[PDB]
Amino acid sequence: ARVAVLISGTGSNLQALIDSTREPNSSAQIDIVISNKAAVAGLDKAERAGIPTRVINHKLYKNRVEFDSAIDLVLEEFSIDIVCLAGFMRILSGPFVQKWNGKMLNIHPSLLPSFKGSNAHEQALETGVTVTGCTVHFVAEDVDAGQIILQEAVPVKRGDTVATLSERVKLAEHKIFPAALQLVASGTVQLGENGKICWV
Ligand SMILES: Nc1nc(=O)c2c(CCc3ccc(C(=O)N[C@@H](/C=C/C(=O)O)C(=O)O)cc3)c[nH]c2[nH]1
Ligand SMILES: NCC(=O)N[C@@H]1O[C@H](COP(=O)([O-])[O-])[C@@H](O)[C@H]1O
Structure with missing residues (x-):
């Protein structure tokens, strides 16, 4: 299963997720890490692990749905099956939550x-x-x-x-x-x- 992890802050839960996916018997692979804030400690953990990172600043979009769409586009780009919220502090809109x-x-x-x-x-x-x-x-x-x-x-x-x-x-x-x-x-x-x- 292809997994995306959404972060906003530190990301110790992210690290624990990363470690468990390195296990040979793991059914999950983390293919992309998305932060709504630039230069948070979670991006470095993901880069240290060798996982692609994308920053989608919600304070640069028209509203919630539009910003959720920018995330959804990245999820589709990396063919994501499962989304993990690891300290992600944004309330996701109706349609986004319903799709996933x-x-x-x-x-x-x-x-x-x-x-x-x-x-x-x-x-x-x-x-x-x-x-x-x-x-x-x-x-x-x-x-x-x-x-x-x-x-x-x-x-x-x-x-x-x-x-x-x-x-x-x-x-x-x-x-x-x-x-x-x-x-x-x-x-x-x-x-x-x-x-x-x-x-x-
Ligand atoms: N539909 C939906 N259900 C959820 O359970 C959920 C979650 C899980 C945890 C969660 C729930 C509410 C807020 C929250 O209310 N954050 C507010 C303030 C955060 C801040 O000031 O940093 C916010 O909406 O911005 C932040 C985090 C994230 N996004 C979600 N979306
Ligand atoms: N969204 C609900 C919430 O309160 N999340 C909390 O943010 C922390 C992030 O830890 P981390 O950044 O070290 O993974 C977690 O401890 C989690 O309980």
């Missing part, structure tokens, strides 16, 4: 449906849960509401901050996101026509 429905994955630093949004760790600490985690899910039009593929629970220790908690959760992210990508790219896991998750 059941073919686009995202990592979220909480045990969904708990703590949807931009600051899951902050929410988790404010609420006072002792167990949080991370979720890999198919991207639906509604934010963080797509079908769940994999989840891993991560303990919250007393005195935790966003710095320490995210550090611990990211260790789980680096596990389940490559694992989920493999499940999808191998055809083991797919989006069911009923809407739900289908195994084989």
